Design a protein around this nucleic acid. Structure first.
Ligand SMILES: Nc1nc2c(ncn2COCCOP(=O)(O)OP(=O)(O)OP(=O)(O)O)c(=O)[nH]1
Ligand SMILES: [Mg+2]
Ligand SMILES: [Mg+2]
Ligand SMILES: [Mg+2]
Ligand SMILES: [Mg+2]
Lengths: 1064, 265
DNA sequence: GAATTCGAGCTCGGTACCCGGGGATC
DNA sequence: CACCGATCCCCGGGTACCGAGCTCGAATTC
């Protein structure tokens, strides 16, 4: 029936029965270990409670929901289904070649067959209607194209004008790189069957410059039709002359959708006025796996046929109403969810778990993939589903069971169901996943860039984000649970369900789909490219829209392409006037600095002129800026000559950030925190416009624009510093500019000296002014400076006011904002490295310095001496409480109870552990210890917890086996091991690093001398030493009496008298 | 002044400077047990227990109030409270004051320096005044009772007695004292002997009739006495202990001692 | 002929870079 | 095939002196 063969299993009668033997209740007490294996002939069965039915039989009943209309060709909709479709939210846009010979029987109109005649690319808009119907509109037309310079190709390939898939025309674009560039004549070369251009852009005549050959068909669709968005409401429109949408027949359905159409871009309209999000479904799944080999304490491995998936939690929310609708639990073997768990679910209003039981692992995974195809969740989520869950399942389904996943997406076949991992590609910054018409939002990646945690395990995230003390099931306890009866398998099922409920709670706290969709709408990319393909394609697509409007073309450069080096000079970081500053420190800083420079100075590719001929007919200072960038003179013509393209691009994104910030003052605190993070994400997309120019070997770079941006930034920072130092050097000039300074004059000698700066900020240490209305006057100071020095889009604004600041080092400082909060800026309390123990005690110390008066007085007194003078005389008596904390931590680190989760350091793997050159790192040691023990090996950007275990003869010989003072990368156990085996921690290391963190922070109190600080911090600690064991014994055998701890003072004094006479 | 005040101006600092003069950095990473009756500087060299009593009579004024105090000598773990008393560390020193100020569990010691100038005045080199804190919990095991028999030696005599001693676990030594004074330090391939009377051939000792044969296990006994660069002195034996001990105390102005543990008969 | 600064000669930590990597700050 | 930038601090590991000790014996001194 179907015109496109359906490549998901609608039917099976024989499969590969793998299953544990411990499932077999009638079998002798030791014929239990290992797994079954081997082919079995029966359609895969699912047992829901007492009932049973074949997994792939849609029929009347069903143990899980289904949103599918077709299933293997049979049309399972109620007869008379013919919904009218007038508006249809679009969430994903696929694109796929479609051959007019393949669609003979699909019975289209002419105007789609002629748009695919040998072949076309068809842009499928996937979506919903207001009534919950899964739409799929196929947009015929819409062919990719690039440009090649007319003369260049004509000479490089003589021209005097099957060969008709490359229709061309002569257009008059202009290259985007320079102001001097002239509009040449190009050829616009219409490729169809888009993949073919990927050859013809790397391989056809590579000495010609192809202009827009990287722009896929989706972007041509979004941009060529003005208004269109990749995520938003649409509407079917009457068409060019009257041509309409052509509702397909259920056999010609290409996707699993309910209704389908064959439109062209003229049959669609953007339909603003709808804003809301339709009834789209969210799956939040989570697999649980068992290891079934000889060592069933090894971590499962997907390739091993006996290390099997056992359970799949699967929650099915409604994305609009946020309502959990179904709680499915797939289970290998019997699984009785505990009554306590069932009752907590019923208490919370959540649906009852539908536990589905299977015999074989294949039946479970086939039923899960049948649910994924049948329900067809538009959005999937989970926690670490891109690094573990989907890779485990797809490894099983493709290696072990040979199931084609190309049809289990939203298309019925020939679709992408791929996962990508960093896997020493050295450019992939993340592991991606692309199932078609299914938006995988792994909440792992959504949380790693919304909260700073040392460990991002889901329990740690649940505690930190939801404040929800979950109980974790270690993969080591799953054999012992699974091996017992159905009730313990039910306990595993409880922990699976609770995992997925926590992940749904995270998803609906952050709502990543909404924020991501705002970005996808504004950029022009689909939402999956927003989730995965970096910042440069956002900027590139927005710039491509602008360029194509303005009549430019963006040359193709990577066709001409295949540590810690830099391409140009970045920003100025002034040298801090380090120290504890107890006077007010106003922080001015430019708002949207580099975007404001790009707009103020009209920086672009199209406005740059490297040569002074292009501007030889324009006035200087009035028509063009002239700047020495990188030692090279650069002329940037101003607007009213040519508007920058980066300016208009930035307009859109800066409006988005400003609207998100305009909803912060009027929101709850917990939702203002999310709004803060969303405006920070849009800030990153604004700074990535700058960053996109200055990305070498990136799409469309101009290190002249990027170096100009930073060059003007450095001149603005210095210009601001000299303005503040020149204008307000004396208090009378401050009073002349702002008469409200009269009521701010604190008793001291006034001064206003920049004591630090960074790319845009300047920290003005306002002596002699009160902090009270120093922010109220700082707004006016900032407006004055922005008006005197800088062009309109540039805006200096008083950001903070510190009543106390500890300018430690360049990008390090601590300070209590006015009457208010602590701001900690790069001082290792805000760093994911350390162990909770040191972080906690360092925080206690900085709170003492700032909040406890009488340690802030003592600390501010520490600066009346040069640092070394403190080495001899005692620190002022206020610092005594500052040393009590250190003393307590010394005590508290030796005391033998020491749950070692306080001592777990982390570090991110951050590249394939063979891509390191310095391979002697602690987290790499632990990575290889984990891979040696068959444990859960981390992934390339995971964080690798580790403890520093005590130097013992045992650890030493173990290290020499795998191969004085061992390195801390050889004393590098991981905490699960170091708890199981009670190996005791390296107190020497942990206390030396406690003092190291204290010393790094508080060297600012002692003139930034780390050694003086180090000495003065170790003074607090109570030193003790005893004549060591095996030695005091034999000395006590010689009548050596003890003098010290274990005696009264008279006995110690007296026996010293005796010793002095003896030893005399 | 300070509640514990220990004053070493010159004309007693030259005594103490002569005590540290035997050419040592050795007793720097030591522990000073101050208290009544003086300061005792105990250190461990190669595994052996070295002591330097500094009686209260060996400071220009010694006053101590409160419980016994123990300082690591290594101030800040680089400098040292005793590096001042080296031979020529600070050329022109005139006076050193050692004042302890505090309350028993947490005291601090300050050590001041004063270097000479002309026309009778003293520059306080405040770059190099040192401040250390009492150890506040410790135990040290000091030598006890009395010797049963002590034998006084000299510089070449003790050098040849050390020469007799061994190199490794191959070579145990033996400090046999026979009847009537035949004190003798042998090994397999070495022997030394001398007579002890209570011209050139008279060592002195006390209770020499108490014969014995202690036996030394550790080669380090040679090395220690050269690290100290000891110039000869009393050699005192303790045999009323389960593990007998020999102390060796330089006979010069100072009392630097080293106790080694002897195996039985 | 017995002693003995002296001067190579070594060891044993500093101290100074110095490079990679983590991971901050713009 | 993939893909925002730079600056910059700290820390661990790795290297190179460098000198301050001591030590060792071999001449120089009783
Ligand atoms: N390419 C790139 N550059 C970045 C990035 N971050 C900083 N820069 C440099 O900062 C310029 C001004 O710093 P801010 O982002 O604090 O100030 P802002 O952008 O001006 O926004 P607000 O100052 O209003 O918060 C980045 O992620 N990518
Ligand atoms: Mg999950
Ligand atoms: Mg997972
Ligand atoms: Mg800014
Ligand atoms: Mg800033």
């Amino acid at each position: 029936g179907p015109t496109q063969r359906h490549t998901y299993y609608s039917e099976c009668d024989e499969f590969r029965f793998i299953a544990p033997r411990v499932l077999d209740e009638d079998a002798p007490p030791e014929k239990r270990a290992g797994v079954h294996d081997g082919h079995l002939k029966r359609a895969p069965k699912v047992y829901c409670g007492g009932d049973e039915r074949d997994v792939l039989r849609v029929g009347s009943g069903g143990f899980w929901p289904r949103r599918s209309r077709l299933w293997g060709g049979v049309d399972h909709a109620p007869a008379g289904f013919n919904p009218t479709v007038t508006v249809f939210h679009v969430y994903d846009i696929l694109e796929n070649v479609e051959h007019a010979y393949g669609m003979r029987a699909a019975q289209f109109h002419a105007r789609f067959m002629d748009a695919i005649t040998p072949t076309g690319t068809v842009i499928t808009l996937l979506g919903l209607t207001p009534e919950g119907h899964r739409v799929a509109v196929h947009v015929y037309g819409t062919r990719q194209y690039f440009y090649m310079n007319k003369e260049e190709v004509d000479r490089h390939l003589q021209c005097r004008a099957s060969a008709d898939h490359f229709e061309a025309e002569v257009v008059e674009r202009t290259d985007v790189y320079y102001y001097e560039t002239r509009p040449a004549l190009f050829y616009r070369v219409y490729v169809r069957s888009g993949r073919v251009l990927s050859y013809l852009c790397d391989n056809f005549c590579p000495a010609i410059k192809k202009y827009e050959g990287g722009v896929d068909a989706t972007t041509r669709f979004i941009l060529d039709n003005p208004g269109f968005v990749t995520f938003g409401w649409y509407r079917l429109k009457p068409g060019r002359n009257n041509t309409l949408a052509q509702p397909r027949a259920p056999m010609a359905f290409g996707t699993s959708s309910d209704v389908e159409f064959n439109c062209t871009a003229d049959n669609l309209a953007i339909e603003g006025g709808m804003s809301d999000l339709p009834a789209y479904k969210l799956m939040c799944f989570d697999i649980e796996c068992k290891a079934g080999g000889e060592d069933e304490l090894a971590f499962p491995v997907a390739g091993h046929p006996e290390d099997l998936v056992i359970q799949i939690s699967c929650l099915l929310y409604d994305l609009s109403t946020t309502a959990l609708e179904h709680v499915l639990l797939f289970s290998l073997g019997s699984c009785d969810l505990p009554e306590s768990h069932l009752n907590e679910l019923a208490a919370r209003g959540l649906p009852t778990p539908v536990v589905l039981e299977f015999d074989s692992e294949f039946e479970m995974l086939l039923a899960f993939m049948t649910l994924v195809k049948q329900y067809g969740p538009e959005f999937v989520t989970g926690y670490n589903i891109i690094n573990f869950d989907w890779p485990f399942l797809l490894a099983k389904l493709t290696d072990i069971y040979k199931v084609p996943l190309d049809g289990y997406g939203r298309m019925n076949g020939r679709g992408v169901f791929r996962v990508w991992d960093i896997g020493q590609s050295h450019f992939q910054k993340r592991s991606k996943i692309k199932v078609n018409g299914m938006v995988n939002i792994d909440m792992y990646g959504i949380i790693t860039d919304k909260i700073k945690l040392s460990s991002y395990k889901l329990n740690a995230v649940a505690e930190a984000v939801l404040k929800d003390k979950k109980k974790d099931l270690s993969y080591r306890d799953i054999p012992a649970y699974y091996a017992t009866g159905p009730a313990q398998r039910g306990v595993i099922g409880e922990y699976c369900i609770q995992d997925s409920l926590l992940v749904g709670q995270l998803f609906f706290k952050f709502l990543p789909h909404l924020e991501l969709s705002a970005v996808a709408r504004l950029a022009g990319i689909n939402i999956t490219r927003t989730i995965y393909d970096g910042q440069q394609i956002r900027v590139f697509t927005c710039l491509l829209r602008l360029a194509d409007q303005k009549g430019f073309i963006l040359p193709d450069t990577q066709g001409r392409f295949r540590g810690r080096h830099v391409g140009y000079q970045g920003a100025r970081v002034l040298d801090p006037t380090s120290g504890f500053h107890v006077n007010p420190v106003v922080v001015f800083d430019f708002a949207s600095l580099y975007p404001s420079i790009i707009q103020a100075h009209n920086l672009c590719f199209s406005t740059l002129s490297l040569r002074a001929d292009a501007v030889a007919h324009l006035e200087a200072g009035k028509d063009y800026l002239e700047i020495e960038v990188g030692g090279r003179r650069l002329f940037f013509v101003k607007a009213h000559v040519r508007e920058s393209l980066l300016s208009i691009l930035l307009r859109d994104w800066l409006a988005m950030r400003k609207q998100i910030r305009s909803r912060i003052p009027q929101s709850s605190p917990e939702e203002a925190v999310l709004l803060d993070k969303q405006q920070a994400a849009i800030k990153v997309v604004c700074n990535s416009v700058y960053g996109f120019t200055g990305v070498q070997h990136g799409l469309l770079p101009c290190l002249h624009v990027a170096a100009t941006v930073t060059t003007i930034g450095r001149e603005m920072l210095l210009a601001t510093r000299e303005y503040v130092h020149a204008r307000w050097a004396a208090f009378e000039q401050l009073l002349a500019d702002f008469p409200e300074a009269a009521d701010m004059r604190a008793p001291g000698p006034y001064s206003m000296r920049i004591i630090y700066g960074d790319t845009d900020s300047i920290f003005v240490l306002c002596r002699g002014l009160t902090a009270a209305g120093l922010t109220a006057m700082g707004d006016k100071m900032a407006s004055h400076i922005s008006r005197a020095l800088f062009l309109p889009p540039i805006k200096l604004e008083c950001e903070k006011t510190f009543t106390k600041l500890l300018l430690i080092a360049k990008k390090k400082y601590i300070g209590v904002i006015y009457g208010g909060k602590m701001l900690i800026k790069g001082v290792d309390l805000v760093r994911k490295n350390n162990c909770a123990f040191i972080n906690r005690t360092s925080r206690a110390l900085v709170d003492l310095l700032f909040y406890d008066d009488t340690v802030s007085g003592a600390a501010a007194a520490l600066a009346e001496r040069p640092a070394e003078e403190w080495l001899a005389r005692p620190l002022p008596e206020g610092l005594q409480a500052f040393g009590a904390v250190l003393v307590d931590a010394h005590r508290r680190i030796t005391d033998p109870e020491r749950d070692i989760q306080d001592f777990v350091l982390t570090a991110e793997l951050s590249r394939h552990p063979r891509a390191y050159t310095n391979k002697r790192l602690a987290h790499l040691t632990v990575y290889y210890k984990l891979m040696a023990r068959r444990a859960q090996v981390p992934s390339i950007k995971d964080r690798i917890p580790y403890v520093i275990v005590a130097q013992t003869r045992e650890v030493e010989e173990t290290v020499a086996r795998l191969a004085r003072k061992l390195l801390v990368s050889e004393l590098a156990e991981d905490p699960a091991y170091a708890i199981a085996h009670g190996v005791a921690l390296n107190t020497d290391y942990y206390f030396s690093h406690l003092l190291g963190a204290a010393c790094v922070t508080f060297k600012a109190l002692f003139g930034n001398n780390a050694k003086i600080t180090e000495s003065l911090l170790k003074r607090f600690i109570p030193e003790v030493w005893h004549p060591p064991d095996d030695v005091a014994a034999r000395l006590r055998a010689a009548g050596f009496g003890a003098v010290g701890a274990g005696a009264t003072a008279e006995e110690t004094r007296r026996m010293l008298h005796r010793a002095f006479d003896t030893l005399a | 002044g300070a509640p514990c005040q220990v004053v070493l101006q010159g004309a007693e600092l030259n005594g103490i400077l002569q005590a540290f003069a035997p050419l040592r950095t050795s007793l720097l990473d030591s522990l000073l047990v101050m208290g009544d009756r003086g300061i005792l500087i105990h250190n461990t060299i190669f595994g052996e227990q070295v002591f330097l009593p500094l009686e209260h009579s060996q400071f220009s004024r010694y006053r101590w109030r409160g419980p016994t105090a123990a300082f690591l000598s290594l101030v800040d773990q680089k400098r040292s409270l005793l590096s001042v008393f080296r031979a020529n560390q600070y050329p022109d020193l005139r006076r050193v004051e050692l004042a302890i100020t505090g309350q028993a569990p947490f005291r601090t010691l300050v050590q001041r320096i004063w270097t000479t100038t002309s026309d009778g005045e003293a520059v306080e080199l405040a770059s190099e005044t040192l401040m250390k804190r009492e150890l506040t919990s410790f135990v040290v095991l000091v030598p006890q009772g009395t010797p049963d028999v002590q034998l006084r030696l000299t510089r070449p005599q003790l050098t040849k007695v050390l020469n007799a001693t061994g190199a490794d676990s191959a070579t145990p030594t033996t400090f046999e004292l026979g009847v009537n004074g035949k004190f003798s330090v042998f090994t397999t391939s070495t022997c030394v002997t001398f007579a002890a009377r209570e011209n050139a051939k008279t060592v002195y000792g006390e209770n020499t009739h108490r014969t014995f044969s202690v036996v030394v296990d550790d080669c380090s006994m040679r090395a220690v006495l050269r690290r100290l660069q000891v110039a000869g002195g009393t050699l005192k034996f303790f045999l009323t202990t389960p593990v007998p001990s020999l102390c060796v105390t330089a006979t010069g102005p100072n009392a630097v001692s080293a106790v080694f543990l002897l195996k039985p008969q």
